[PDB]
Structure formats: structure tokens, C-alpha cells
Amino acid sequence: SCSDVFQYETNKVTRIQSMNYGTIKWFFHVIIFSYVCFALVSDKLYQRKEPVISSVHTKVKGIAEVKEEILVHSVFDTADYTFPLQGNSFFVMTNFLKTEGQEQRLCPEYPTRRTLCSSDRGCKKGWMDPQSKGIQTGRCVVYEGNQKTCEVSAWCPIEAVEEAPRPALLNSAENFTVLIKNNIDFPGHNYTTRNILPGLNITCTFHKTQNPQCPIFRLGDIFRETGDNFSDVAIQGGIMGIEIYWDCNLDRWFHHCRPKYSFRRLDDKTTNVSLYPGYNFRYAKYYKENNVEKRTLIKVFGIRFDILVFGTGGKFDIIQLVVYIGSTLSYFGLAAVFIDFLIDTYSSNCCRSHIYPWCKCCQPCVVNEYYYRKKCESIVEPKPTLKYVSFVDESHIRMVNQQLLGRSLQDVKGQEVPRSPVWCQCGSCLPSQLPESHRCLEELCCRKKPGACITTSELFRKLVLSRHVLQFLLLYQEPLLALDVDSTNSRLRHCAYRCYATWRFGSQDMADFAILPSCCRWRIRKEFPKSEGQYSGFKSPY
Amino acid sequence: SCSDVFQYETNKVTRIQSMNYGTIKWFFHVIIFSYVCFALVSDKLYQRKEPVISSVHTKVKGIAEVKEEILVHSVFDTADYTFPLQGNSFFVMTNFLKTEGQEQRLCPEYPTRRTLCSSDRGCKKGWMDPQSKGIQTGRCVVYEGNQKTCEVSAWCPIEAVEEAPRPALLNSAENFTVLIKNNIDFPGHNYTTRNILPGLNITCTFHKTQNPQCPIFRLGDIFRETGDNFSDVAIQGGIMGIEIYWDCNLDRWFHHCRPKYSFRRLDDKTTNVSLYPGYNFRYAKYYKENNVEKRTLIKVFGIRFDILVFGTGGKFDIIQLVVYIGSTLSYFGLAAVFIDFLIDTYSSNCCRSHIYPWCKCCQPCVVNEYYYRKKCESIVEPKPTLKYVSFVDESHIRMVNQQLLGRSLQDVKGQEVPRSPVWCQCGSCLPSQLPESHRCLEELCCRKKPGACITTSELFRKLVLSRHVLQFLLLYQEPLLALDVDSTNSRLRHCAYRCYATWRFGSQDMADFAILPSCCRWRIRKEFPKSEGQYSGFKSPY
Amino acid sequence: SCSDVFQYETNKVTRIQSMNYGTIKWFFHVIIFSYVCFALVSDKLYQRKEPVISSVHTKVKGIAEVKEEILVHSVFDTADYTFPLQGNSFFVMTNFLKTEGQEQRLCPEYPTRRTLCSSDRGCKKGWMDPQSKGIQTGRCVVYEGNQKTCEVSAWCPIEAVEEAPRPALLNSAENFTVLIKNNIDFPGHNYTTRNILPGLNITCTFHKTQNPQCPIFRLGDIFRETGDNFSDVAIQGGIMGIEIYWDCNLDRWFHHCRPKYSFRRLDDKTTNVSLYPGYNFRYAKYYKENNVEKRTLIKVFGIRFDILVFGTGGKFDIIQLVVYIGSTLSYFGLAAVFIDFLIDTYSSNCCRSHIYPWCKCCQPCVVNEYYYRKKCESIVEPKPTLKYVSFVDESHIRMVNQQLLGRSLQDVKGQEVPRSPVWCQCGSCLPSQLPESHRCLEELCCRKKPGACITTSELFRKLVLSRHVLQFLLLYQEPLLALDVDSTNSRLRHCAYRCYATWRFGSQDMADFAILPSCCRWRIRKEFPKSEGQYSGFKSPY
Numbered sequence A, B, C: 001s002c003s004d005v006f007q008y009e010t011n012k013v014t015r016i017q018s019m020n021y022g023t024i025k026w027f028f029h030v031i032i033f034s035y036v037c038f039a040l041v042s043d044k045l046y047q048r049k050e051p052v053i054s055s056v057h058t059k060v061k062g063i064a065e066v067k068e069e070i071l072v073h074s075v076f077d078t079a080d081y082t083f084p085l086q087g088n089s090f091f092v093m094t095n096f097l098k099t100e101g102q103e104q105r106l107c108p109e110y111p112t113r114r115t116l117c118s119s120d121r122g123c124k125k126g127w128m129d130p131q132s133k134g135i136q137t138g139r140c141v142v143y144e145g146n147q148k149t150c151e152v153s154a155w156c157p158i159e160a161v162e163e164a165p166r167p168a169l170l171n172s173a174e175n176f177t178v179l180i181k182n183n184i185d186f187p188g189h190n191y192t193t194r195n196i197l198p199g200l201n202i203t204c205t206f207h208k209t210q211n212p213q214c215p216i217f218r219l220g221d222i223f224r225e226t227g228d229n230f231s232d233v234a235i236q237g238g239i240m241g242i243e244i245y246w247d248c249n250l251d252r253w254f255h256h257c258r259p260k261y262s263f264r265r266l267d268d269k270t271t272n273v274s275l276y277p278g279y280n281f282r283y284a285k286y287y288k289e290n291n292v293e294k295r296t297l298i299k300v301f302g303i304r305f306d307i308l309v310f311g312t313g314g315k316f317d318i319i320q321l322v323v324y325i326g327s328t329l330s331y332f333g334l335a336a337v338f339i340d341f342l343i344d345t346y347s348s349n350c351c352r353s354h355i356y357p358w359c360k361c362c363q364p365c366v367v368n369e370y371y372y373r374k375k376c377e378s379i380v381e382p383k384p385t386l387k388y389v390s391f392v393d394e395s396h397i398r399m400v401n402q403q404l405l406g407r408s409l410q411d412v413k414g415q416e417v418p419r420s421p422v423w424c425q426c427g428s429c430l431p432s433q434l435p436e437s438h439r440c441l442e443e444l445c446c447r448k449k450p451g452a453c454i455t456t457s458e459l460f461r462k463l464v465l466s467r468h469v470l471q472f473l474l475l476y477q478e479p480l481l482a483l484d485v486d487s488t489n490s491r492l493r494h495c496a497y498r499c500y501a502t503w504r505f506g507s508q509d510m511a512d513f514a515i516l517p518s519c520c521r522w523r524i525r526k527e528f529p530k531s532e533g534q535y536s537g538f539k540s541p542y
């Protein structure tokens, strides 16, 4: 069946010369194409995108003169306020509280409404209060003279309950600078670059307009970019995020991979002591004095700077473009769908019985009846119960698609399709000579109301009973045809049924399932009788 | 050609009134639509998704009483067991081994099966053993009395080969808490939020059911969530991961962005000393005594906690929805594809010659023959070798789509299509008077087996030779038509060929490529001869 | 209207038995299918992919003998050159400069072209020079004998301006090893694994061919992999990245999740002192001597190693496959689109008037005229101005789709379609007896140039004026039909218009909008006159 392989099925189409429908089609196509191109270009859907692999290296710079009422002036440098960047973050100490000479011993705990005692009964041995850095020994002792407080085993003397200094000791930390070196890679695209390129000015400091590509940031500038007071956030500390966004196109014609610097405060501006506002931690400087292990505890407050590097690098990928085009292809059939919907809707008689009289504007849309008739063809399932009846008086045909069960087809009305016995209205029918189960089918008249019969019509005699015509029809199909007398009569009788059905019902779709009236049936049978036997009747083709 | 632009091609369609096929179509459509909607909703394919940009800040809390057999009790606080979170991780020391008063000197290395010597020959000067922290000087000396061990230059005294203390010195570290503050951003969606919201209870501790949004975690609770013993993992250490998952919908109607906390052990539970089980490191406390640079070495064991923050934030995007709909649109033609497949398959005669007799269930599916005939029209390539022959005796036509090369078309049988000379079976043919290369074409008879001729048929004389009919056919196309005698004969002869071909082959598709038999051809030529010259014969239209 | 629901519209198609077009269709289909399968397989578009969640744990190993000209030999171990991995990075000190015994005091700043003074006027009190670690007191003092330099408040003595030692003190750091343990998770796929599996050899060191899965890396090996000198990068320092790529398939049949190790230098190989080449930082060792707070400052140079873990884990997802198939489905209609384009193009007369004479190769493609005629049907908008005129002399018909406004239709020529009064060319027409606004329509002749009339044609009399024929046509539609005399004449006259229009214009599409010539119109009206009144004329069906 190689010939079956080498076959191409092309749809049958109707081409309409309509201003409106062609204009609609082209408008739809232009709009769809424009949106598809716009989406492709704007979202770069032709590109395979890869997240950035980043490495950050910071260099902080600046010294601070610190005033401490002990008054003494001291200079702090990088070794004293910062530690090298770890995990894309660096910390600059802005403030501190110091507690010198701590030994692991037993000491009276610093007085507070909790630790104040009036007798030994107010303390419990081994009690770990969450707001304490020690474990009670059960007895309370003098802190300073009159005042009695719970004794604890801990690093002693205990820290004073004091607030962070105001102003911050390292308030000059706003004039410090940080140089950020950012290296990025797209391993899939095998593209690595960096934020500092040859020819970049190193004598600059970042400004979002003047110097938007300078990687040297003054911390005060950052805070101002974000809308915060460095002098205030310095007192208790904070977290600031330096976002480096990489929107990179790796196509060599449209190549562009530069960073965009932005800033965002990352700590909640909470004043709730319960939530530990700011950013601080306790750091121990261990040492030895007089063979005793001692500790200087610094409560460090500062600002942690987080370098948040994110972005994508895109490069043209054939497969992504293919996928996007394939997804968008089906949107070009919507013009056809919409116009076919219009043709189907405006083909309904409802749109002229009611709609047009009200809205006369839509009257010219009646042409869609022509488009529908030239577009759609309707066919019914050729079931064995399917039947068609035509009445000469009536101006149409009836599709009786229901079982005739003890009910004459004359009285069994069905759906409306366009082009002596009690049930007889022409006076030329005979009772059905067939099984009473199916007699009702053959109990049909040429008409619904009394009057003349259609077997009297002069056309019937010449379009159904004319022997010359029927024999010529037989010869047309079979030029050299010879038959017995009975065979000739049978061939003629079947041709007569065929010709009547074609005459009254037209198309062969309805003439195959047509039903002849009893009058015409028996007239034809009389004209072309059979030698012996009984006539079978109607037989459904399928 | 503006009119050519303003054209709409609509497919010709056949509408079938079938219960089965309409039900199948609507079932397919409902299922496809339901699945498309389900996928869109479940995977939120209408949303553009953006990975989370996270910042974590931890605050650990708790003190531990530590027993060391030197027995001495000591209190450890945050300054003694933890360092501020770096890179989304914090470390809590749970155990330690201490080696005090180390000087860079020469010392006997701690005894092991490796370092035990019996003479100086067992050591090599400058030898860096991987299991050693020193470099041999070549000579071995007394470690403690009788026992001789390799001498090394190193920090001395060398560490003892001892196991981590059991129980862990800071085993109370399970009662410590950590408050995690997590800030997240979606820069593309310009949406930042945090894990602690106003009105959240700070007096809580996390419980996956009671307190699933409390960011205060007791370390023992974490280990239990994961199914581990804090007391065991404390001895040698470990790594625990605190996963914060953000499934965030940023649509204001369906907005939801809260974290989901989970826990996962991140260290292999390996007991293989070769793989360095646990988590430990050697930390040096440098100091000065007697103007000598000394070191206290602590082998620190603890649990490193990694805060693993991941997730996506989605917001409705028009383009993503368009793409998804476009991808899913083509699935609505599968009903048509499947039903057309059914109509094509059940139209085959194979499905009734064999299938129906066996499986009588499928007999009612014969109606698809009607659907096929009303659906598909078949046409062959009008090649110059294409030819059609009809034999009056035969009940069909033959498509001889092959070159007749010295072989009379009578004997050259081809494919089966439905509706005196040695090769003559009617006794009314003449030899072909044309080039012998193509004579074989015109060497055709009206029939395949002996008998009468079809030129004798009464229809032929009236449908091919009747001058009145032919002149009327000519006049129909050309009402006022006048011709010369020879021109009249030629017009009539061609009309006779046309009418015979239409009579026997029917459609003009087959009548254009039809071939008249020699008998009929020469009868027609005799009826309508030409004044002079020889008859050309058949000429392929294409 | 449940029957309307139970309807299936199937496209009418034409099946072509062409070698070329079937071969083209199957070639297109095979190519499209092959590419779709290839893209699906290669990009694993059936898979849902999830980024990796990673945790890294390093263990560095090795000791270094360090020579310092003070010459003194010292051994450095892990406690002396590295700190535990923080944020997926570890640092190994390779070199250092030491400045012992620093006190916060006033000191002469180290001499440079900047700090050299000749008098007190060269210094400004409180001046913070960016290249200084102190704040000037306004006066300059002796540094060493003759040489005078600006005095500053700072940690003193000030650091010497000296270069990093050559060779690096810890140049043996290339023989150090690092064991990397990498744990990964795909939470969506609920799949966690690790880079070290049971049965892996721990006595190995990484080699990209011999030992590609060993997680023990010698730092010198890394530098060589990247193409760098450890001895040079050690002097000032650097950043090296150890990339661990995870291309993981989580399908149990095709499961594979192993790491791929690669190396990349992450620091710019810049020699520009202005950009701070290398990797170094200043670290303070604080201590106490004689109750004085002192500092040993180490300028640390080393190599920071960044463990860069990236990758995706994919697992089969039904929805992704559905989406991809839906996107690719519309590419299977391109064969139809292309072949229909060919059939439309090769159907044009332009392709035979010009193209074929030049390029005779393309002559056999004329069959596409047959394919077009059997494929496309063209229909015009049935506007009320649409009209068709046929002239017996002419060999075609004219579609006059324009308003006849005071211009006889005889002289109003329109588009070309295939099959006594001054404007009369047959001598058998009469002036139009209708409103002069529309008389011009009825002012049409049977012909364009002088001669006989078509009302004289014998067919016209029998195909338009034969009463027997017309009454038979009426009876065919209405077998039993009785009419009044005037009604009979009207029915016959309209049937005559219908039959002439069908005879001359053929299809009813053109015969509904046909216009009869004045001669034929008035001949028919004379044959079948009306009892009283005036004839209305032509009426557009739509």
C-alpha cells in the first residue's frame, strides 16, 4: 500500500471576497504578530538564562578618633573595627561597651528589680535566669554598701546594665570607604567578568548619577541612599545590604554585562528590646595576669554590610525560540475561529426575525447566510430508523427519525426539513401487505389533507411510469442490457421508486431513506408487477 | 491586487448529527480543559517566579556550667562558645580539649606506634609525617622515663592523643535558644518581607504544630525534630541545617508569604576516623609570658548550624499565561484528530469483510462509510501517462497509469476504479492509424471478452451520433453559432468523444483522461468525418 | 437544542495521490519529529528542575616550616594559618608582615615623600591622610636622626612601608591538602546526597582523569589546574574558586548525581597598587604588658578559597512534558501550510505565461491548477450592487460590482469573470420602463457589438419561451399545481428569467445576480404578459 503512504490530504476551502472579513483577518494577524514579537523581545524568550555565580572581595578603609571618658583619645584602624569579608558580608564596629578584668568567680549580680534581695530566701541555688549571665549560689550578698543582690557564679565583675553610648564612639565610621570587587561567572555560557574594568577611575566614589559604576562606597552615602541616619544606626547597630544586580546579555552583537548598585536596609527598625534591636554581640578578649585567666568583654555594636549579588545572563538558544514560536503559533487561528463564529451566528434566522428589525444596523450581515450555505453541509446519521416523508400539499419534507411502532407514518410527524383506509387522504391507497410490525411504515399517503392524489399528476406518469424513460435510464448505466420479463419488471419498478424519491426529495441523501406513499407504491407495482411472490418493501441502505 | 488582500479562506466542513461523535468531542474538550486549568492552578503557570534574596541574623542565648577535672566548675556564656553568624551559619561549641603553654621548640612527639623508637635509626631528619604536627630532627629522645619517641620541632608540648570528653563539657548547650531573623526580597516583584511580624509572640519557642511560626529554636528541639541525640553529637560535633522555605504568592487577592521551618542533619553520620567524623577545629589562643610567645591550643568540637533559606515568589504575568494558553491550545484538535481517525478506519472494507462477522458489536459503525464519502474526495495526479478505460462487459473502470510501450491498452490492465484485429472482441474495430509508438493506446476495444459491440447500443447512436443532440449541445454554449462544413464536423466529432466519455466514465476528472475504444472512435469519425488530413487522437489535458 | 450540542463538524478534505506531495509531507513530519525528540532529550524538557541546596565542610591539613631573619625556624600548623570555613570559603595564610609592641600613642610617621617635613609648617593638626593610619598633631619630629617626619596619634610604632616577603614565608602551603565534604539537597524532589560515598578511596588526591572524584585537593594542584604559580600568588595573595557542579538526574532508571570539580581564579591578576592587588588584611593580636595595652599587627597575605556549588536536579514531570508537546504540536501543520502555498502559487497563470518558457524544469507543476480547482471555491459578497452581465458575442461574463448611476449597464464594464436605442446593438431592445434612477440597469443589450439578437436563437425559444417546458418545470416542483391565468403567466415569466440566467451564467451564484438584456426581458414579458400593472424588474436576493 505504498500508494496510500504517498498521499496528501488538503482541506477544501471557500475563499470569500469580503472587505470586512479580510480586514478583520489582517488586523488580527498584525496584532497577534506585534504582541508575539514584543513579548519575545521584552522578556528575551529567545534566550537561555543562567543565574550568576558570584565572588565578592571588600577592602574597607578609614581610621577613627575615639573619645572615651576614663577623657582619652585613641585611633582605631581596620585591625580594630573590621574583620575580612566572610560569606559576602563585612562588619564595621561603630560602638562598644567594655568590661575589663573578668575572672570566673562568684560575684554579686548587677542590681536590677530582679536581682535585688532583702534576704537569702529571695534566691534559689543553681537558678539560671534567662536575663542573667550567671548561676545563683542560693545566697545574696552586698553589691555596693547598703544594696543587696543575688550572688552568681559567672565571669565577674558582671556587666553593667547600661545603654549603648550616645554619640557612637566610632561615629566617624560614616567617612570610611569600602571598595567592592565582584567577580561573576555563567558556567553554562562560559562567561566570566568583573565589576572593575581597565580604564575605570579609581579616584572616584559612588554616585548613582555621576559615578554609577564606581565600586568605592562611603558608608554614609549608602545610608543616605536608603534614607537612614548613620549616627543613629551606629549607636545600636544595624544591617545594610549592598545589592549588585547583573542583567547581562551575552550576545556579542547585543552584549552588555555591567552591574547596577542599589542599597537596602536589612534589619527591622524595631525599638522593642524584646526583639534585640540593632546588631551587637559579646566578644571576649582572653588574657593572663598573675597566672590568672582573665577576660575583657566587649559588647560590640556595628553595622553588618551584606553584599547581595543576583542576576541572570542570557544567550540566544535555538530551542527556546522554537518552543516560544510553537506556543504562539496557535494564536493565528483565532481570526479564523472568530470569523467562522460570526458566519455561524449571523446565519441563524433569529438574527433577522428579531435582531434586524430592532437594530437595523446589522441588516447587511445577512450575507453570512450565503457564506454558511457555501461553507457547511449537514448530514444525519443513517440509522435504520431514519425515514423521510414528503406530502404534495406540504411545502417541505419530514425526517421521521423515530421507530414507527403500531403507528402509521402518516400520523407520525417528525422533524421539519426543507426541500379507502382511514389514514388515506387521496382515495387511491391500499392497506399494507407486509408484517404488521412494519406495516405502519408503508401506511403512508401522498398528502396530509383530503384532495386529489399525486399519482394523477402528469409528471408522475412520465417521471415514474414511462416505460421508455425507465428503460433508457437502465440502458444508460448498462448499454447492452437484456433481461427476462420478470427481471425487466423488477428493474423498472426499482428504478421507479428511485426516480420518484429523487423527484420529491431531491438529493440522494434523503432519497435513500425516503418512503414512498402507498398510492404511488401500488401504482408503480401495478405498472411493473412481478411474476410471483410478495413485494418486500423499504430496506434501509445502512 | 488589493482585492486579493481582502480575502478570507474558510474551511469547508461537514456537520454530522451523531450522538456518539458529539459526545466524544465534548468529553475530550471537557477533559482537556479540566486538565489545563488544573495544571495552570497547581503549578501557578500564570505566575512569573523569582528566587528569594535572603539575609539572616541570629541571636543565641544560654549559659553552661562546665565541669573540668583539674574538679572545677566554670560558667560559659555566648562570648565563650559562639561567634556571630557568618555566611548564614553559626557555631556553638559543645566540647573542647585544651593544651596550655605551647612554645615553638623541640620536643619529644607524643607516643604512638609510629613515633616509638628503639634507636636514632628510626627517625629521619626533616620528616613531615601526615599524622604529625611537627618536623623530625632526626634523633629520638625520652618522652617520659623508659619510653623513647621521635623528636620534632613544633609547638610543644605536643597534643595528647585523646578522645573527645564523654559527656560533652557543654552538654547543656541543648537548652540554648537561637532567635532567627530572616529578611527576604524579590527585587523583580519589588517585595520584601520578614519572618517576624508585628503581633507575634516573643515568649514562645518553636513547635511544628503549636508554634510553627516562632523563630526561637531550642537546639535540643531541632535535634529531636531530626531524630538525633544532642548529647552524642555534642561529643564530636556535627552540622545541622535549619531550612526556611518561602512559598510566596505576591498577588494581593491571594497574597501569602510566610516561612516554613524544617531541619536536616548535614554531616555524614560516619564513624570512620579516616574521614574526620563530626565537626572540630584547632584554635590558638596566643599570649606572652616572661617575654616568651606562648599558645593555648583548643581542639574545639561543636555543632555548626546552617540557615538554608530558599523559595520562590510568584506574581501574575500576562506573558506567561499567554505562553501557557498557546501551548495548550493545540490539544483541543485531538478530538477532531481521533474522530477523523475513526471515520477513516471504519470506512475500510476490511472492517466489514472480516471484523464485523467476528465482532458483531462493531457493525453499527458502518455509517462511517457515509461520513467518509461525504468527507473525503480523492484525485490523482493528471500525469500525461494517466488513462482510463471502460469495458461494457466489465462492471467498473481501469486506471492505466503506466506507459503503453508496444502493448495494446486492451491487454495492459491497470488499477481498479469504480464507476478483425487480434485485440478486438467486438468485430467492429480497425487498426490504429497513428504513430506506432502510440498506436497501442488507440488499440483498445469496447470490451474484454467476445460478443456484441457497444456501438450497436441504441443509446450510443442517440448519445453520441445524434446530430440534433450534438448541435443542440454546441448551441447551448454558443447560442448563435455558424461554422463551415468541416468545422461543423470537427466540433461534432469532439462533442461526440466528450459525450461518450461522460456517459461511460461519468465525472469529468475521469472523462478528460478517458480513452475511447477503436470501434466507437472510428464510428464517430465516420459519422463526422473531416475534409482532409488524419485524425490526431487522444491528447492529455495536462 | 440538545441535538445542536450533539454535533461534530469535520473538515471536507481533498486527498491527492501525488508522489511529490506525500513525500514532502512525510519528510517534513520526520524532520520535525526528530528535532522535537532531540530537543526534549538533550534539554530534558520532560523534567522539572530544581536548584541545589548546598552545605560545605572543609578540613585543611599540613604544616609549614617558616624561616624568618630575626634566622629562626618555626613550625606553623592549622591553628596558625587557617580558620574554619565560613560562608563556603576558607583562607590559608601564605605570608605575613609583623609589627610588634604597638601602643596607642604619638609617634613620628614612617618616612615617605608625603610625611617628610622640613619645618612644622608642613603639617596640619588633625589631618587624616588616606594613606595614613594616624592623625597628625600639627608638628613634625625626628624619626631617626637627621630625618624629620610628620607626627601622628596612632598605634605606634607605625608600620614600615615594606613589600611582601619574597619568597613567601609559607610557600610550603602548596603541599597542604583540603578535604571537601559537600552535602546537597533538592527539597522539591526530596533528594539529598553527598560527594563522598561508601567505598570511596580516602588515600587519594584529586586528578581530573585518574582521580576525578577524590575530594582531597592539594592547593598546588589547584593552581596548576588553573595555570598559576602558587609561589607567586602566595607572596601577595589571591582568591581561588573550587567549583562543584551537580548535573543530577533523579529518575531511578536514569539516575545519576555526582559532582564535577573545576577550578577558577577569582581575583584580578592586577598589578595596579591603586586597586590593592592580591588578598591581604591587617589583624591585631591584642595583649597586655606592664599594665599597658599593646598590639602585634600582622599584615596577613594568603589565598582565599571559595567553594562555588551550583547545579540542578531534574525529575520527570508530566505537566512539563504536556506543555512541551503542546508547544511543538503546531509544527506538524507546516507541511500542509507549505504544500498549500505551493498549490496556490503554481495555480497562477503567471507561472506559465512567463516562468515555464524560461525555466522548462517547472512545467510539470501545472497539475497544481487541477489541485487548486478541486481545492478552493471562490464566492463574492452578495451586495445589492452586485450584478452579472453576459454578452453572446463575448466569451465570458462581467461582474459589475459598482453602482449604475445614470450610466447604462451596457457601457458600464466591470471585472472579468469566466463562464433602436443608442445602447442597443441587436435592434430588438426597448427603452427601460422603470424609475430613471435604476433604468440604466435594465438598459442592457444581449451583445456588445452590432449584429443579430440572441432572442432569435432557437435554444432561447425552447429554453425560455417553450410553454410546455416551463409548465413542466413548474409541475416538477409542484406536481398538482393550478393557477389563475395571470398567476400562470407570472410563474412562467419568472421561470423564464430563471432559465435564461441559468443557461447563460450557469451556476446559481451568478444567476441570482444576473441581469437579463432588454431584448430578452421584453420578449419574455410579451410571451407571458401580466393582466395589469407594470413589471418591477430585477431584485437583489440579499
Ligand SMILES: CC(C)CCC[C@@H](C)[C@H]1CC[C@H]2[C@@H]3CC=C4C[C@@H](OC(=O)CCC(=O)O)CC[C@]4(C)[C@H]3CC[C@]12C
Binding pocket: A036, A037, A040, A046, A251, A252, A253, A254, A316, A321, A325
Ligand atoms: C516572533 C516570531 C514570529 C519571529 C521570529 C524572529 C526571529 C527571526 C529572531 C528572534 C530572535 C533573533 C535572534 C536574536 C539573536 C541573535 C544573535 C546574533 O548573534 C550575536 O549577536 C552573536 C554572534 C555570535 O558570536 O554568534 C545573530 C542574530 C540572532 C541569531 C537573531 C536572529 C533573528 C531571530 C532568530
Ligand SMILES: CC(C)CCC[C@@H](C)[C@H]1CC[C@H]2[C@@H]3CC=C4C[C@@H](OC(=O)CCC(=O)O)CC[C@]4(C)[C@H]3CC[C@]12C
Binding pocket: B037, B040, B041, B249, B254, B256
Ligand atoms: C469557559 C468556561 C466554560 C469556564 C471558565 C472557567 C475558568 C476560566 C476558571 C475555572 C477555574 C478557575 C481558576 C480556579 C483557581 C485559581 C487559583 C487562584 O489562585 C489561588 O487560588 C491561589 C491559592 C494559593 O496561593 O495557594 C487564581 C485564579 C484561578 C487560576 C482560577 C482562574 C479562573 C478559572 C481557570
Ligand SMILES: CC(C)CCC[C@@H](C)[C@H]1CC[C@H]2[C@@H]3CC=C4C[C@@H](OC(=O)CCC(=O)O)CC[C@]4(C)[C@H]3CC[C@]12C
Binding pocket: B036, B037, B040, B046, B251, B252, B253, B254, B316, B321, B325
Ligand atoms: C486555563 C485557560 C483555558 C483559561 C484561562 C483562565 C484565566 C482567565 C485566569 C487564569 C489566571 C487568572 C488570573 C490570576 C490572578 C489574577 C490577579 C488578580 O489580582 C490580584 O490578586 C492583585 C490585584 C492587583 O493589585 O492588581 C486579579 C485576577 C487575575 C488577573 C486572574 C484573572 C483570571 C485569570 C487570567
Ligand SMILES: CC(C)CCC[C@@H](C)[C@H]1CC[C@H]2[C@@H]3CC=C4C[C@@H](OC(=O)CCC(=O)O)CC[C@]4(C)[C@H]3CC[C@]12C
Binding pocket: C036, C037, C040, C046, C251, C252, C253, C254, C316, C321, C325
Ligand atoms: C517528543 C514527543 C513527540 C514524544 C513523547 C515521548 C514520551 C512518550 C517520553 C518522553 C519522556 C519519557 C519519560 C522519561 C522518564 C520516565 C521515568 C521512568 O521512571 C523512572 O526512571 C523512575 C521510576 C519510578 O520510580 O517512578 C519511566 C519512564 C518515563 C516516564 C518516560 C516515559 C516515556 C516519555 C514520557
Ligand SMILES: Nc1nc2c(ncn2[C@@H]2O[C@H](COP(=O)(O)OP(=O)(O)O)[C@@H](O)[C@H]2O)c(=O)[nH]1
Binding pocket: A490, A493, A494, A497, A501, A511, A512, A513, A514, A515, A516, A517, A530, A534, A535, A536, A537, A538, A539
Ligand atoms: N426509498 C424507498 N425505496 C423502496 C421503498 N419501497 C421499496 N423500495 C426499494 O425497492 C426494493 C424492494 O422492491 P419491492 O417492491 O419489494 O420489489 P421486490 O423486492 O422485487 O419484491 C428495495 O430494495 C427497496 O430499496 C420505499 O418506500 N422507499
Ligand SMILES: Nc1nc2c(ncn2[C@@H]2O[C@H](COP(=O)(O)OP(=O)(O)O)[C@@H](O)[C@H]2O)c(=O)[nH]1
Binding pocket: B490, B493, B494, B497, B501, B511, B512, B513, B514, B515, B516, B517, B530, B534, B535, B536, B537, B538, B539
Ligand atoms: N478523452 C478522449 N479524447 C479524445 C480521444 N481521441 C480524441 N480525443 C479528443 O479529440 C481531439 C482530436 O480529435 P481527432 O479525432 O484527432 O480530430 P482532429 O483533431 O480534427 O483530426 C483531441 O483534442 C482529443 O482531446 C480519446 O480516446 N479520448
Ligand SMILES: Nc1nc2c(ncn2[C@@H]2O[C@H](COP(=O)(O)OP(=O)(O)O)[C@@H](O)[C@H]2O)c(=O)[nH]1
Binding pocket: C490, C493, C494, C497, C501, C511, C512, C513, C514, C515, C516, C517, C530, C534, C535, C536, C537, C538, C539
Ligand atoms: N436575475 C434576474 N432576475 C430578474 C430580472 N428581471 C426580473 N427578475 C425577476 O423577476 C421578478 C420580477 O418580475 P417582473 O418582470 O417584474 O414581473 P412582475 O413582478 O410580476 O411584475 C423578480 O422577482 C426578479 O427576481 C433580471 O434582469 N435578472
Ligand SMILES: O=C(NNc1ccccc1Cl)[C@]12C[C@H]3C[C@H](C[C@H](C3)C1)C2
Binding pocket: A079, A080, A081, A082, A083, A093, A096, A098, A283, A298, A300
Ligand atoms: O577587638 C577588637 N577591636 N579592638 C577594640 C575593641 C573595643 C575597644 C577597644 C579596642 Cl582596641 C575586635 C575583635 C574582633 C571583633 C570586633 C571587630 C574586630 C575583630 C576587632 C572587635
Ligand SMILES: O=C(NNc1ccccc1Cl)[C@]12C[C@H]3C[C@H](C[C@H](C3)C1)C2
Binding pocket: B079, B080, B081, B082, B083, B093, B096, B098, B283, B298, B300
Ligand atoms: O576561646 C574561645 N572560648 N573560650 C574557651 C574555650 C575553651 C576552653 C575555655 C574557654 Cl574560656 C572561643 C574562641 C573562638 C573559637 C571558639 C568559639 C569562640 C570564638 C570562643 C572558642
Ligand SMILES: O=C(NNc1ccccc1Cl)[C@]12C[C@H]3C[C@H](C[C@H](C3)C1)C2
Binding pocket: C079, C080, C081, C082, C083, C093, C096, C098, C283, C298, C300
Ligand atoms: O595569628 C594567626 N596566626 N599566627 C601567626 C601569624 C603571623 C606570624 C606568626 C604567627 Cl604564630 C592567625 C590569626 C587569625 C588570622 C590569620 C589566620 C588565623 C586566624 C591565624 C592569622
Ligand SMILES: *[C@@H]1O[C@H](CO)[C@@H](O)[C@H](O)[C@H]1NC(C)=O
Binding pocket: A171, A172, A173, A174, A175
Ligand atoms: C567626615 O569627614 C568630614 C571631612 O570631609 C568631616 O567634616 C566630618 O566631621 C566627618 N564626619 C564624622 C562623623 O567624623
Ligand SMILES: *[C@@H]1O[C@H](CO)[C@@H](O)[C@H](O)[C@H]1NC(C)=O
Binding pocket: A201, A203, A204
Ligand atoms: C578621573 O581620573 C582623573 C585622572 O585620569 C582624575 O584626575 C579624576 O579625579 C578622576 N575622576 C574623579 C571624579 O575624581
Ligand SMILES: *[C@@H]1O[C@H](CO)[C@@H](O)[C@H](O)[C@H]1NC(C)=O
Binding pocket: A167, A229, A231, A232, A235
Ligand atoms: C542623627 O542621629 C543623632 C544621634 O542619635 C541625632 O543627634 C541627630 O539628631 C539625628 N539626626 C538625623 C538627621 O536623623
Ligand SMILES: *[C@@H]1O[C@H](CO)[C@@H](O)[C@H](O)[C@H]1NC(C)=O
Binding pocket: B171, B172, B173, B174, B175
Ligand atoms: C535543660 O534544662 C532543664 C530545665 O528545664 C534541665 O532539667 C536539664 O537538665 C537541662 N539539660 C542539660 C543538658 O543541661
Ligand SMILES: *[C@@H]1O[C@H](CO)[C@@H](O)[C@H](O)[C@H]1NC(C)=O
Binding pocket: B201, B203, B204
Ligand atoms: C503569648 O503572649 C502572651 C502575652 O500577650 C503570653 O502570656 C503567652 O505566654 C504567649 N504565648 C506563649 C505560648 O507563651
Ligand SMILES: *[C@@H]1O[C@H](CO)[C@@H](O)[C@H](O)[C@H]1NC(C)=O
Binding pocket: B167, B229, B231, B232, B235
Ligand atoms: C545519648 O548520648 C549519650 C552520650 O553519648 C548517651 O549516654 C545516651 O545513652 C544517648 N541516648 C540516646 C537517647 O541516644
